[PDB]
Amino acid sequence: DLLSCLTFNGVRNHTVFSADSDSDFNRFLHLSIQNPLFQNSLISKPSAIILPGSKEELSNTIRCIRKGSWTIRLRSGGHSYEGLSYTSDTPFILIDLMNLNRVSIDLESETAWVESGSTLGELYYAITESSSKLGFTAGWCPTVGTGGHISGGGFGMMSRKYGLAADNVVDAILIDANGAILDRQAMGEDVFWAIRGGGGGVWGAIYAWKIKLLPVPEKVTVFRVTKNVAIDEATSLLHKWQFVAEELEEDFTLSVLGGADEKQVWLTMLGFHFGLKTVAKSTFDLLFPELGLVEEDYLEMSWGESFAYLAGLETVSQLNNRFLKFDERAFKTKVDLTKEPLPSKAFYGLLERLSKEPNGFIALNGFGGQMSKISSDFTPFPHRSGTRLMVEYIVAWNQSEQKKKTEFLDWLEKVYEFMKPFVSKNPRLGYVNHIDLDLGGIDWGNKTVVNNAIEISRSWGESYFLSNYERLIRAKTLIDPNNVFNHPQSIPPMA
Numbered sequence: 494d495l496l497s498c499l500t501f502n503g504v505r506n507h508t509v510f511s512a513d514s515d516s517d518f519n520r521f522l523h524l525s526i527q528n529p530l531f532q533n534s535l536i537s538k539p540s541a542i543i544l545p546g547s548k549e550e551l552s553n554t555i556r557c558i559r560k561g562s563w564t565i566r567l568r569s570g571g572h573s574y575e576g577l578s579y580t581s582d583t584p585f586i587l588i589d590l591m592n593l594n595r596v597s598i599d600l601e602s603e604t605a606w607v608e609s610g611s612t613l614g615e616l617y618y619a620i621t622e623s624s625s626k627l628g629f630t631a632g633w634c635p636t637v638g639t640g641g642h643i644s645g646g647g648f649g650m651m652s653r654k655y656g657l658a659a660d661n662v663v664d665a666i667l668i669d670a671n672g673a674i675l676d677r678q679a680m681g682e683d684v685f686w687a688i689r690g691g692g693g694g695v696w697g698a699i700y701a702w703k704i705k706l707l708p709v710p711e712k713v714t715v716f717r718v719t720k721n722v723a724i725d726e727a728t729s730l731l732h733k734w735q736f737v738a739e740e741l742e743e744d745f746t747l748s749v750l751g752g753a754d755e756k757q758v759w760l761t762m763l764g765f766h767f768g769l770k771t772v773a774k775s776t777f778d779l780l781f782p783e784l785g786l787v788e789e790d791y792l793e794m795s796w797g798e799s800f801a802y803l804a805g806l807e808t809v810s811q812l813n814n815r816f817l818k819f820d821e822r823a824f825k826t827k828v829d830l831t832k833e834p835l836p837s838k839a840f841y842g843l844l845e846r847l848s849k850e851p852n853g854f855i856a857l858n859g860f861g862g863q864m865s866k867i868s869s870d871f872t873p874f875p876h877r878s879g880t881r882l883m884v885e886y887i888v889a890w891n892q893s894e895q896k897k898k899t900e901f902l903d904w905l906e907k908v909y910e911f912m913k914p915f916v917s918k919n920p921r922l923g924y925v926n927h928i929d930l931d932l933g934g935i936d937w938g939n940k941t942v943v944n945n946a947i948e949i950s951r952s953w954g955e956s957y958f959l960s961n962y963e964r965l966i967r968a969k970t971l972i973d974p975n976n977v978f979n980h981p982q983s984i985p986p987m988a
């Protein structure tokens with residue numbers, strides 16, 4: 494019946510569930526699973542997979558699915574930390590957007606239309622190919638899809654200069670629950686606001702984003718330097734880093750990846766300057782001489798090269814490979830946002846815990862700069878002025894380490910508990926692109942829960958969106974009153 498509808502409407506690229514271990518269905522299913530944690534045979538599988546090739550096919554796909562009794566799941570890059578683009582407790586249809594990966598750059602207006610199956614790397618590659626003086630602000634991981642990423646905000650190495658990816662979206666095409674094809678004018682300002690950070694899988698299916706391309710110099714300066722130190726020095730480095738990072742002028746970003754193993758601590762310093770190396774080094778010589786950076790650490794390169802380099806890719810060309818395996822490990826991650834400086838003992842304790850679990854690592858970013866100049870309600874991401882750091886805790890493992898899964902998860906849980914007193918409180922803040930089901934979830938098939946959905950959902954909702962939660966609920970009711978687009982943490986419509 495679903496197939497007959499799709500055929501009648503000219504949607505041809507689909508595959509039904511097959512039990513065949515290496516069926517084509519299984520190949521398409523796994524192609525974009527980016528967290529192996531959700532790859533095993535015990536996980537829910539789609540009844541069919543549809544690959545629309547145009548906005549019309551996407552529209553008609555949704556229209557057909559509604560005639561039936563299916564849960565819709567949209568997948569762009571498949572990076573959901575909780576696998577929410579390709580799992581469901583109820584029978585579901587997976588709409589995989591990988592064929593919608595066209596990027597159209599308009600050099601006369603310095604904007605681009607980006608189909609939502611496009612990855613960040615594909616976007617960055619397209620931009621660098623078109624111009625040596627344009628770039629875009631989005632995340633660090635190249636295989637992340639624009640569909641989920643921009644829908645949730647999108648923070649990266651240029652966010653201190655230009656804000657989130659979603660802060661630079663000027664139009665969009667949203668396909669709603671009825672298959673309507675809506676641009677910014679059609680969807681209205683509340684819905685256009687909601688889609689720019691309100692979370693993927695909630696408002697409808699984004700077909701394409703229209704973004705403003707942003708100036709970059711023909712040469713930027715970057716460094717990627719790993720310090721191998723002991724805990725005393727690592728603690729003093731991280732404690733000073735937090736001040737340097739938040740306080741740097743907007744033309745600079747200094748971020749950290751860190752981990753340890755008994756007495757050996759490693760800190761990878763990621764630096765970016767919107768300009769030349771003499772200025773870059775003068776700045777860090779003054780503000781952070783403790784890093785011990787030397788001239789040879791500073792590299793001048795194009796913006797495109799810088800984004801490939803900072804992510805550890807071999808070449809700019811690799812940005813354009815959506816199936817390049819960036820990190821093939823099962824993982825779980827949590828995040829904190831901070832409002833007060835972290836005391837030295839917080840870093841010391843975090844490092845002690847990392848030293849006991851070599852499979853764990855942290856990623857540290859400063860806010861400030863343009864992130865403090867954008868109002869908390871400009872887009873749904875509310876963590877602007879007053880927010881000092883974003884701190885990510887990750888534990889990751891390969892298949893040969895699977896028996897330690899429980900131990901790994903316990904470690905992460907204990908790290909998050911340790912950090913509680915030092916980070917944001919009342920509520921403990923989060924980021925919707927860093928979706929965390931530990932906060933809870935709605936079973937939309939449960940009547941008593943659904944009756945109280947707004948209050949229940951406030952637990953994660955206010956963590957992700959603070960005071961923007963209310964407007965999100967109103968936008969949800971306007972664009973998806975029947976809740977066609979739902980998941981355990983989707984914004985509830987009013988009854």
Ligand SMILES: *Cc1cc2c(nc3c(=O)[nH]c(=O)nc-3n2C[C@H](O)[C@H](O)[C@H](O)COP(=O)(O)OP(=O)(O)OC[C@H]2O[C@@H](n3cnc4c(N)ncnc43)[C@H](O)[C@@H]2O)c(*)c1C
Nearest residue numbers: 569570571572573578632633634638640641648693694699
């Ligand atoms: C795996 C991974 C994730 C990263 C990485 N680095 C990040 C960074 O530097 N900055 C960030 O801000 N975020 C980083 N993240 C997290 C990602 O930002 C999030 O995981 C994104 O949400 C992922 O988006 P995508 O890859 O498209 O993942 P999906 O699982 O397909 O979708 C997520 C979510 O959104 C819905 N959705 C997808 N596509 C659409 C469209 N077109 N319209 C509406 N909704 C859509 C899905 O159904 C799901 O709910 C680094 C790494 C390695």
Ligand SMILES: *[C@@H]1O[C@H](CO)[C@@H](O[C@@H]2O[C@H](CO)[C@@H](O[C@@H]3O[C@H](CO)[C@@H](O)[C@H](O)[C@@H]3O)[C@H](O)[C@H]2NC(C)=O)[C@H](O)[C@H]1NC(C)=O
Nearest residue numbers: 505506507508517520521524543544545546591592593816
């Ligand atoms: C539905 O969509 C999928 C995914 O795009 C289509 O599969 C893709 O088909 C193209 C050909 O049109 C493949 O391109 C070629 O692959 C071969 C190697 O296998 C190579 O010789 C060519 O140079 C080119 O790379 C592509 O590999 C393939 N992608 C995947 C993930 O399978 C499929 O054709 C569509 N199905 C229908 C019925 O339209």
Ligand SMILES: COc1cc2c(cc1O)-c1cc3ccc(OC)c(O)c3c[n+]1CC2
Nearest residue numbers: 633650748750763820824826856858887889
């Ligand atoms: C499971 O695999 C991975 C998972 C993640 C990351 C890296 C991985 O390898 C990661 C690394 C980051 C490094 C730097 C950075 O800003 C400078 C980030 O925002 C990062 C975000 N993330 C998101 C989670």
Ligand SMILES: *[C@@H]1O[C@H](CO)[C@@H](O)[C@H](O)[C@H]1NC(C)=O
Nearest residue numbers: 934936938939940941942943
């Ligand atoms: C609905 O949810 C409540 C609270 O989570 C749970 O206790 C109850 O068992 C559920 N009811 C049904 C009918 O599943």
Ligand SMILES: [Mg+2]
Nearest residue numbers: 513514515516
């Ligand atoms: Mg077989």
